[PDB]
Amino acid sequence: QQGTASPYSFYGIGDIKFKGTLEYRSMAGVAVEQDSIHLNIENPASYASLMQTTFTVGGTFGTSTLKSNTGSAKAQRTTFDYLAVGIPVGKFGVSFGLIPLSSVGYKILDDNTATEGAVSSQLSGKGGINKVYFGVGYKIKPHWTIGADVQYNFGKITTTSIEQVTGVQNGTSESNASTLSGANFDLGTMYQTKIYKKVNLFTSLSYTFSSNLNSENVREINVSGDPDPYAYPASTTKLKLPSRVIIGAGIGESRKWLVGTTLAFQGEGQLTNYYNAMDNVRYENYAKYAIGGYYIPNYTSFTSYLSRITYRAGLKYEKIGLIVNNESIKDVGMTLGAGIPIPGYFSNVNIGIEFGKKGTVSSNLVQENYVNFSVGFSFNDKWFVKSKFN
Amino acid sequence: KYYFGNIKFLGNTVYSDQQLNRYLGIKKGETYNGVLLEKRIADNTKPDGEDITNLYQNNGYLFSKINAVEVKTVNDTIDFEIRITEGPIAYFNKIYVTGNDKTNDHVIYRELRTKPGNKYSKEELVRTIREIGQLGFFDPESIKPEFRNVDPAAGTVDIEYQLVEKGSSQVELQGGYGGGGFIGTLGLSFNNFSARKLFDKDAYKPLPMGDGQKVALRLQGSTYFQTYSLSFSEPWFGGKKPVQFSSSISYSKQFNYNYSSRDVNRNQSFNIFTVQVGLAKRLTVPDDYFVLSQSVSYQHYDLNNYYTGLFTFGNGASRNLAYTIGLSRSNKGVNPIFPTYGSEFSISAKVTPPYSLFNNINYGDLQNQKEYKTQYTGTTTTTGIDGQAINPGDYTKTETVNGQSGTVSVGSDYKSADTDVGKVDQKKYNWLEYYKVKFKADWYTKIYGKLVLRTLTEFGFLGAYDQSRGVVPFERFYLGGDGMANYSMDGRETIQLRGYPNNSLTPIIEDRNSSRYGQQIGATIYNKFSMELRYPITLKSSASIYALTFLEAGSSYPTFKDYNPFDLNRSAGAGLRVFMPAFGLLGIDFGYGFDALPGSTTNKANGWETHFIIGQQF
Amino acid sequence: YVDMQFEDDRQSTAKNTVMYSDQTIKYGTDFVRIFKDVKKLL
Amino acid sequence: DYKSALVAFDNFIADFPGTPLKEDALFYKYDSAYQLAINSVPSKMEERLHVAQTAYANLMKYKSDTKYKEKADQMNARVETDLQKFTK
Ligand SMILES: CCCCCCCCCCCCCC(=O)O[C@H](CCCCCCCCCCC)CC(=O)O[C@@H]1[C@@H](NC(=O)C[C@@H](CCCCCCCCCCC)OC(=O)CCCCCCCCCCC)[C@H](OC[C@H]2O[C@H](OP(=O)(O)O)[C@H](NC(=O)C[C@H](O)CCCCCCCCCCC)[C@@H](OC(=O)C[C@H](O)CCCCCCCCCCC)[C@@H]2O)O[C@H](CO[C@]2(C(=O)O)C[C@@H](O[C@]3(C(=O)O)C[C@@H](O)[C@@H](O)[C@@H]([C@H](O)CO)O3)[C@@H](O[C@H]3O[C@H]([C@@H](O)CO)[C@@H](OP(=O)(O)O)[C@H](O[C@H]4O[C@H]([C@@H](O)CO[C@H]5O[C@H]([C@@H](O)CO)[C@@H](O)[C@H](O)[C@@H]5O)[C@@H](OP(=O)(O)O)[C@H](O)[C@@H]4O)[C@@H]3O)[C@@H]([C@H](O)CO)O2)[C@H]1OP(=O)(O)O
Ligand SMILES: CCCCCCCCCCCCCCCCCCCC(=O)O[C@H](COC(=O)CCCCCCCCCCCCCC)COP(=O)(O)OCCN
Ligand SMILES: CCCCCCCCCCCCCCCCCCCC(=O)O[C@H](COC(=O)CCCCCCCCCCCCCC)COP(=O)(O)OCCN
Numbered sequence A: 001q002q003g004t005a006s007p008y009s010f011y012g013i014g015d016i017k018f019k020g021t022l023e024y025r026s027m028a029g030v031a032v033e034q035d036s037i038h039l040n041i042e043n044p045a046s047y048a049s050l051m052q053t054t055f056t057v058g059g060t061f062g063t064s065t066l067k068s069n070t071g072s073a074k075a076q077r078t079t080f081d082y083l084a085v086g087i088p089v090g091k092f093g094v095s096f097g098l099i100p101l102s103s104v105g106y107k108i109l110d111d112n113t114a115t116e117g118a119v120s121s122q123l124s125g126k127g128g129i130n131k132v133y134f135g136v137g138y139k140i141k142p143h144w145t146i147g148a149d150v151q152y153n154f155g156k157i158t159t160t161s162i163e164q165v166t167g168v169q170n171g172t173s174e175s176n177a178s179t180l181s182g183a184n185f186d187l188g189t190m191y192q193t194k195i196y197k198k199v200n201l202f203t204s205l206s207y208t209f210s211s212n213l214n215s216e217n218v219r220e221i222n223v224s225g226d227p228d229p230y231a232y233p234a235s236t237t238k239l240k241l242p243s244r245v246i247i248g249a250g251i252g253e254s255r256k257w258l259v260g261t262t263l264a265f266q267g268e269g270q271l272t273n274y275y276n277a278m279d280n281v282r283y284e285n286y287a288k289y290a291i292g293g294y295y296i297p298n299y300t301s302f303t304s305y306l307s308r309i310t311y312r313a314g315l316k317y318e319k320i321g322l323i324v325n326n327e328s329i330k331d332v333g334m335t336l337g338a339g340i341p342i343p344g345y346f347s348n349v350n351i352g353i354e355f356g357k358k359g360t361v362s363s364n365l366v367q368e369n370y371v372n373f374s375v376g377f378s379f380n381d382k383w384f385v386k387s388k389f390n
Numbered sequence B: 001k002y003y004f005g006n007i008k009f010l011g012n013t014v015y016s017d018q019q020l021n022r023y024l025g026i027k028k029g030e031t032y033n034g035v036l037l038e039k040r041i042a043d044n045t046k047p048d049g050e051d052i053t054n055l056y057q058n059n060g061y062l063f064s065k066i067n068a069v070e071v072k073t074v075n076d077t078i079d080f081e082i083r084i085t086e087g088p089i090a091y092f093n094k095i096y097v098t099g100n101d102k103t104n105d106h107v108i109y110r111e112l113r114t115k116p117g118n119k120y121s122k123e124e125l126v127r128t129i130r131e132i133g134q135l136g137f138f139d140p141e142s143i144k145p146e147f148r149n150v151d152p153a154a155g156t157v158d159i160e161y162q163l164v165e166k167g168s169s170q171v172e173l174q175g176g177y178g179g180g181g182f183i184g185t186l187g188l189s190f191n192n193f194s195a196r197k198l199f200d201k202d203a204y205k206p207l208p209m210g211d212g213q214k215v216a217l218r219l220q221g222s223t224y225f226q227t228y229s230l231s232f233s234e235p236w237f238g239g240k241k242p243v244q245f246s247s248s249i250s251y252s253k254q255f256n257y258n259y260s261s262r263d264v265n266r267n268q269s270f271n272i273f274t275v276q277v278g279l280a281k282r283l284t285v286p287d288d289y290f291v292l293s294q295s296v297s298y299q300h301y302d303l304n305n306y307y308t309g310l311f312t313f314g315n316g317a318s319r320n321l322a323y324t325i326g327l328s329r330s331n332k333g334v335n336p337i338f339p340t341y342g343s344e345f346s347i348s349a350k351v352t353p354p355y356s357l358f359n360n361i362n363y364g365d366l367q368n369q370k371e372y373k374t375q376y377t378g379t380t381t382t383t384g385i386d387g388q389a390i391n392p393g394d395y396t397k398t399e400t401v402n403g404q405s406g407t408v409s410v411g412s413d414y415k416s417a418d419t420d421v422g423k424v425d426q427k428k429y430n431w432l433e434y435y436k437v438k439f440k441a442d443w444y445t446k447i448y449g450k451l452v453l454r455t456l457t458e459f460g461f462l463g464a465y466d467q468s469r470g471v472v473p474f475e476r477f478y479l480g481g482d483g484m485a486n487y488s489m490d491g492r493e494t495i496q497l498r499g500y501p502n503n504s505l506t507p508i509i510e511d512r513n514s515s516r517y518g519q520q521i522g523a524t525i526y527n528k529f530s531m532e533l534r535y536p537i538t539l540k541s542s543a544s545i546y547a548l549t550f551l552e553a554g555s556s557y558p559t560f561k562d563y564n565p566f567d568l569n570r571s572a573g574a575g576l577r578v579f580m581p582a583f584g585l586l587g588i589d590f591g592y593g594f595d596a597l598p599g600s601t602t603n604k605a606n607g608w609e610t611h612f613i614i615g616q617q618f
Numbered sequence C: 001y002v003d004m005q006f007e008d009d010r011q012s013t014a015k016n017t018v019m020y021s022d023q024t025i026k027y028g029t030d031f032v033r034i035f036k037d038v039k040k041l042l
Numbered sequence D: 001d002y003k004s005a006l007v008a009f010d011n012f013i014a015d016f017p018g019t020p021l022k023e024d025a026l027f028y029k030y031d032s033a034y035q036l037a038i039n040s041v042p043s044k045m046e047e048r049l050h051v052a053q054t055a056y057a058n059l060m061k062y063k064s065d066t067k068y069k070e071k072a073d074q075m076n077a078r079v080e081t082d083l084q085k086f087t088k
């Protein structure tokens, strides 16, 4: 039931899962335009631009092939990506939902059987950090919006290591469980102008404050057959989530085409817990560079329906921020998507395919090639309509 | 053989030829089918058919008549000239009912959808008949609306509702199958009670009649529970708006039931006495699709040898006083069995008074007090398992000498005695203190043709104001299986997660050596996400059958510290649902579990599963 | 027409969703209705 | 359901002429139009405002010293005040 299979999820708080809704994830996270039917969870100011109530749900089916200097393996994971609700309230906008901050998952087996007296290990990990958010956006101007949100982080990360010698039948199983909880605040703004005829200049700025995460660790060692487990004293460690600054800018004509770029930078953080402390692994600042956009042939078309589908594409280069064996781990990928609008309604079905490469095989590291297929549902309906003619 | 060709419409001033052609949906070159043509023009089999006639009659054209005429027939190709007689628009002028000998007019006139001064509509007449039949005081086969004083020139029509009274009293004999077990209810109901004339003994024929108030004395039972209740409901509280006021007094005896093995131990049971009052009214703001529900209830639980799971005070009693408020918005339509559009959002919150704040009692130090330590209440000196004297009034402790185990006197050193868990739990749960929040979101949309997509997301949270007191052992969530409605009065909720057995995903006791390992204690948190694709094969009033495909994922958690909303048990499958008015809702589903059941040694998929239910087991 | 199923409207009484069970089964088998149908079939 | 009350009352004051309940029917007809005008679509608010004035005049013409004169006078104040917004 894990969300990831990458061994790199062991370090830090796990692999960053949420990267935007399918409508924006298919554009490499570029959300410069102030949409009226889609939710831009990463920027609270977008909540004010909503025109109708929006209900979003998304899921993905990931396929990855882990490669190392020894061999290669294939892994597949299926998960639920998000659940968000947007409600337009006059000039204000309110949004609340649940998104996965990070995920921990890996199933490594070191088979040393067939040789008496050889220890076999079965490393496994599960859990992650989830986020609950509540944001409010306000339209300071018809095309200028500002907003803020509060996010509560909560989750449990459990790491289990079972070792069994070839001869004996009773092995040991050490398990580490950490419960994390904390809150953070985000601020954002979006400004849209008109540079040329029918061409607009979209700008968006978002800032996330640093947050403190409280982790309650519990480490216990169990041996097969023995009914009394050996438990270590409980410990409490403090983690610091780094601050994020997302800058976006793009040019394009609304409902016709859009081209934009986004730059995301993270500050200093402390994601090293008691169980993931290593000497060959360090940390650096996260930095993401992405270019994406969309193209709609003819939104108001009555002859062909394929012209009304929003075609999205994007490129992305991310510096995860961890240096393993003196090698910076970076992720490079391309994304493609399409938004099919249900006839007669603003609701649409989003489909996207993302493929890329994370890590490298050099310095005895692991390289991951992934091809993820995602589906998203965006439902829109107009509420709060008063009925006259008393 | 004959082929259709050159279909034209005459006399269609309101609707253009292009709009009608789409409604008819007959193209040139198709085989000549007389039945198909008449069905598309005027579907007499059903009153809600999508025909051209219904298009005109539903918009005030009472005198509309559509008749097809074959113009030419050459080269095996037949040509039709659909003739439409629109006629003048008509409005409702006088609406009166006749035949009500025992029912007041205000009760019937308030349920008529054909308001005077509105354009004639066949849907309103059909809806009015349905609403009049829902009352139950009249004959379902004699609700005949008769048109009177029809004035085509003036464009006004008068409707007279001829009703046949058949007695307000009714007998209820219903049955259903949910949660893997049959459930039946039997009761007598008086749907035309009048509380105004309660003290008036002059009019007491089979209870005072008049207002549309309803009083019912029903009995519901299953394998593990039996409940007797008396309920009073006021459909229109205040007389101005359809505000529902309901009260109920019930007594239930719930036995200990193991949903896994479907076995009931009749020796362990508890009795619940509940009194509830509720007020529900449709809100006008923010919109007319919002409904506010409020309720106040008082319950008294009487445990009788109920020593199971987290219930250590098997011979005590608990009292629950809670207030529940719920906001719901529903705009679904049009058929409740097979919705094609709309959504339903519901948020509820049940809260109890915060007794822990005002009463100065330390629930954490209860186990370290003399009053909560095991003691010998006898008055005769006895001998413990250790072979030593146990004088009356001395504290005791449990010691295992050789194979057998027993109590051993500790003297007056209460600090070394065993804490009485039964007394501590009783003090902690003497007055239930908790808060329950439930969130549900259901959305319906048409993808292509008759196929509709349904998205369902449910959340449930149970907690306590003081962590030292602990979460109450009642009002818990059980996930997995076919699911069952909230028939029990203890707050237990059974959630359906196809592809897995009943209550198979509920957290279990993992203490191993607690003497109760493997027992299902209940979950405090639960979240289910489901997606379905349904296709209707028949949507008639006699029988509504539709097929469905689903993709579900859900999980239950014991505490908030273990809440992982994205660690779910996934499943997939297909099912068939049939609804008949006499036989109720029947459903058969086949789901495949992609995950292993909790507590399983091997991480292997659960596999295929079969679920059968009767009724709305939500 | 009486057997047709319709959603609640502005003129229909509001349903209380925050109360315990009423000892009734929604959309369940109605034996009284079955008995009435059998009589008509005789 | 003020829209249906106007039609129902119009027929009653016509099908049963010379009745002691006419005074009450006249007032309720005015109230039905008053509530329908004060809360109605702004497109046809003027039409309903005029109907309210007509109903008020009929009530006063029937019995000048009507029992509902105090309430009727107050209702007409709102109609006249709101009518000034449409004084094109
Ligand atoms: C808004 C909407 C509505 C919601 C409303 C909620 C918001 C309001 C605020 C609520 C918070 C209130 C908390 C509270 O307070 O009230 C609590 C009650 C609250 C009631 C609320 C009612 C709500 C009503 C709702 C109505 C609805 C209509 C109870 C409590 O209190 O429980 C506390 C528990 N918290 C919970 O349970 C909450 C629960 C949550 C429950 C509520 C969930 C509600 C959700 C439902 C809503 C859903 C709606 C849809 O969380 C969880 O379930 C998980 C998370 C939940 C996930 C939610 C998911 C949502 C999903 C939604 C999906 C849609 C807490 O955990 C920590 C966290 O708490 C919350 O978060 P978390 O829990 O982490 O999650 C905070 N805050 C939060 O907001 C989190 C909220 O969830 C957030 C809400 C989220 C809402 C989401 C909304 C969604 C809907 C919206 C949609 C849009 C977090 O802040 C944070 O970071 C987080 C953040 O920033 C805060 C702000 C966040 C706000 C969010 C904004 C909103 C945003 C929303 C949108 C984004 C914070 O990190 O642990 C405490 C334990 O502390 C004590 C104790 O109990 O006394 C004292 C400790 O000492 C301290 C100290 O003193 O300082 C503590 C630290 O400071 C630290 O420094 C520490 C050092 O490390 C020590 O080394 O020291 C220590 O003991 C030591 O202290 C003494 C001292 O001197 C120190 O030296 C020593 O004395 P001495 O030596 O003499 O000097 C003692 O030793 C003596 O004694 C010992 C024995 O002898 C004695 O014997 C026994 O007795 C002892 C007694 O003490 C026992 O009584 C035992 O303790 C002993 O162990 C022992 O067994 C011997 O020991 P030994 O040596 O032998 O070992 C020893 O020898 C010697 O004798 C001992 O050593 C400890 C012991 O170790 C445990 O064993 O025990 C508990 O007590 P507390 O102290 O009072 O806090
Ligand atoms: C979650 C539990 C807490 C819920 C609390 C409910 C709050 C009650 C609000 C009562 C309504 C406000 C009072 C004034 C009503 C008159 C209308 C004017 C108000 C207003 O400006 O907003 C209108 C619509 O929003 C409104 O009228 C306000 C919207 C209220 C919030 C909507 C969401 C409620 C919670 C349900 C969501 C969760 C699902 C469960 C059902 C838009 O008016 P306009 O178009 O003229 O624009 C205004 C520009 N001039
Ligand atoms: C938080 C739970 C624990 C604490 C308990 C909270 C108790 C809340 C207060 C009690 C509820 C009664 C008061 C609100 C209802 C009165 C409204 C009268 C009916 C009505 O027509 O509604 C209009 C606005 O309604 C409205 O009032 C719209 C808003 C109604 C919903 C707001 C209540 C909370 C909803 C969320 C519940 C779930 C919580 C989840 C955490 C007011 O019109 P008018 O009467 O002036 O006439 C003018 C037009 N008719």
Ligand SMILES: *[C@@H](O)[C@@H](COC(=O)CCCCCCCCCCCCCCCCC)OC(=O)CCCCCCCCCCCCCCCCC
Binding pocket: A057, A058, A059, A060, A061, A078, A079, A375, A376, A377, B531, B532, B533, B549, B550, B551, B572, B573, B574, B592
């Ligand atoms: C490996 O052994 C195999 C499992 O083998 C089996 O035993 C077969 C399992 C049973 C197959 C299904 C039987 C029922 C037929 C109907 C299927 C349901 C279709 C529903 C479509 C419409 C929605 C209602 O393993 C597999 O077969 C692997 C399965 C991987 C599936 C990956 C694709 C799932 C979709 C990804 C997105 C997540 C879904 C939610 C989308 C909305 C977002 C909220």
